[PDB]
Ligand binder design. Structure first.
Ligand SMILES: CCN(CCC(=O)O)C(=O)c1cccs1
Length: 330
């Protein structure tokens, strides 16, 4: 089997991408944030505290003839940005882009933190990291991809995120018309539960490529590119007037600047992030101080190849027995 679904930016900055997902019978379509940095499929629901729902579409398990409570199961998750959610668990039929999984754990939120409530465009998350990170207790549950894998034509999914435009998530096949050149594949470590890999270096603008190993994760659920302070300083030093501000929370630069590109290495290959992808626009409405798309990871503990980086590529998440990541230009 295969599936193919369009993913759409939630706003004009590409802060996140939503993908429609069919849950239950008859189908309830919710728009979920596909997140290769986590491993829970959770939704706003008829069980969510009413004051914490503000415009989201909810899953109502009592209206689904295929829903079943997963007795005793609870979940609770905290994300790197400080947001969180928790609740109980149903199994139900879940379909993405024509690919159907029966018996998928659908984690129904009883509580969500304010950042979720305040984002009316995201009805939940669909985790695509390794199932060892799933938070369901006392019996850990599998991701949608793990449940689908055996049925797929090939045990892969691909992320093709757009710049200020829709893109595609495909399951079970590699669309050879969706990228240019070849795909260069790189080894993955699953030791932390992430799609963790080692970039071979970077260049700033037209500058020389610096060969240096940068371990990090491919995370579609993180907006920006978080890299070591040395690398980030080298980038922003090429932008007149750019500076790091603790009170704003990262590197800001003049909205009148033209940003240089940023290149990252994948083996001997190179992925070029255009400068315009690094502009996250005014810090506040009307401000001439623009918020940078490349930020330091020094306070995170891990480097993160988020959407800024991934949307410059066609990315293969290869879930074979020995997993690998693939990157192509497009
Ligand atoms: C020989 C280089 N090479 C292949 C890169 C390519 O796709 O061309 C590799 O080392 C690996 C790929 C995946 C796991 S290791």
């Amino acid at each position: 089997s295969t599936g193919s679904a369009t993913t759409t930016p939630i706003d004009s900055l590409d802060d996140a991408y939503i993908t429609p997902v069919q849950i239950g019978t008859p189908a309830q379509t919710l728009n979920l944030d596909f997140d290769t940095g986590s491993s829970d499929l959770w939704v706003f629901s008829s069980e969510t505290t009413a004051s914490e729902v503000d415009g989201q579409t909810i899953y109502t398990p009592s209206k689904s003839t295929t829903a079943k409570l997963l007795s005793g199961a609870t979940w609770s998750i905290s994300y790197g940005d400080g947001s969180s959610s928790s609740g109980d668990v149903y199994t139900d039929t879940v379909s993405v882009g024509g690919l159907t999984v029966t018996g998928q754990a659908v984690e129904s939120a009883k509580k969500v933190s304010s950042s979720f409530t305040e984002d009316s465009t995201i009805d939940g998350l669909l985790g695509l990291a390794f199932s060892t990170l799933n938070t369901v207790s006392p019996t850990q549950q599998k991701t949608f991809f793990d449940n689908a894998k055996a049925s797929l034509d090939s045990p892969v999914f691909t992320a093709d995120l757009g710049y200020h435009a829709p893109g595609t998530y495909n399951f079970g096949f590699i669309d050879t018309t969706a990228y240019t050149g070849s795909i260069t594949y790189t080894a993955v470590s699953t030791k932390q539960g992430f799609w963790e890999w080692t970039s071979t270096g970077y260049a700033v603008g037209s500058g020389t490529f610096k060969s240096t190993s940068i371990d990090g994760i491919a995370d579609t659920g993180t907006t920006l590119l978080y890299l070591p302070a040395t690398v980030v300083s080298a980038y922003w030093a090429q932008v007149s007037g750019a500076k790091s501000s603790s009170s704003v929370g990262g590197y800001v630069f003049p909205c009148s600047a033209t940003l240089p590109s940023f290149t990252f290495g994948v083996g001997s290959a190179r992925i070029v992030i255009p400068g315009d992808y690094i502009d996250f626009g005014p810090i506040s409405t009307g401000s001439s101080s623009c918020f940078g798309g490349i930020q330091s990871s020094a306070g995170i503990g891990i480097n993160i190849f988020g959407d800024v980086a991934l949307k410059a590529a066609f990315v293969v998440f290869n879930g074979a027995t020995t997993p690998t990541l693939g990157f192509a230009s497009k």
